[PDB]
Amino acid sequence: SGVIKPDMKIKLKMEGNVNGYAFVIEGEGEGKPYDGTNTINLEVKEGAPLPFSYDILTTAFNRAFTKYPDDIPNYFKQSFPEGYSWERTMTFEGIVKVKSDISLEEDSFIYEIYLKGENFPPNGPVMQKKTTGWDASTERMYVRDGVLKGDVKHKLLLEGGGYYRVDFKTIYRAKKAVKLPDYHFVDHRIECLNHDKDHNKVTVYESAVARNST
């Protein structure tokens, strides 16, 4: 077998604070890198119960888990076993800044994540836990400054039936040189499952599939 097996494990830690409320979350999970699916079981270790919407954390909990056709160079799978890091800004109609380092030990991906959220309205749906997940999304992948960037015009769904616009800007940086792809798309679906009353324990499931521009 090669660096990336059809089944791979996940271990992660996130340290963060949102609107001055600090927390630590640990996760373990598994996915199918070639199918583009992954599941993570998350546990709040510090800062329970979280006084904000779990949805602003879920997209932080690895594009190694993306279905790719052979005719698009796979920025992410090429980067292993050394791996890659990413940095993301999420700008809400509130701002979240996330940094993640993705490494590989045998068949386990390891993520070290730092997240800072600020400027959320205290009685808004983010701090009042009135969001109902992310819509399906399309991330445009494009090269700038010798690394891969992703943009999403995202939509956070609000209980009652509205949405907030959230602009995602991510920089993906391989730890070694890899073949750079032409611009392309990644279609995402992310969901929360099996959450307990305070989201002390949450499962995140994501599917991600790449497709070309042509």
Curated annotation (Swiss-Prot):
Biotechnology usage: Fluorescent proteins have become a useful and ubiquitous tool for making chimeric proteins, where they function as a fluorescent protein tag. Typically they tolerate N- and C-terminal fusion to a broad variety of proteins. They have been expressed in most known cell types and are used as a noninvasive fluorescent marker in living cells and organisms. They enable a wide range of applications where they have functioned as a cell lineage tracer, reporter of gene expression, or as a measure of protein-protein interactions.
Tissue-specificity statement: Tentacle and oral disk.
One annotated GO biological process: bioluminescence
Post-translational modification: Contains a chromophore consisting of modified amino acid residues. The chromophore is formed by autocatalytic backbone condensation between Xaa-N and Gly-(N+2), oxidation of Tyr-(N+1) to didehydrotyrosine, and formation of a double bond to the alpha-amino nitrogen of residue Xaa-N. Maturation of the chromophore requires nothing other than molecular oxygen. The precise stereochemistry of the tyrosine has not been determined.
Keywords of the record: Chromophore, Luminescence, Photoprotein
Biological role: Pigment protein that is green in color.
Family listed: Belongs to the GFP family.
Name the record gives this protein: GFP-like fluorescent chromoprotein cFP484
Organism: Clavularia sp.
Taxonomy of the source species: Eukaryota, Metazoa, Cnidaria, Anthozoa, Octocorallia
First-to-last residue of the parent protein present: 44 to 260 of 266
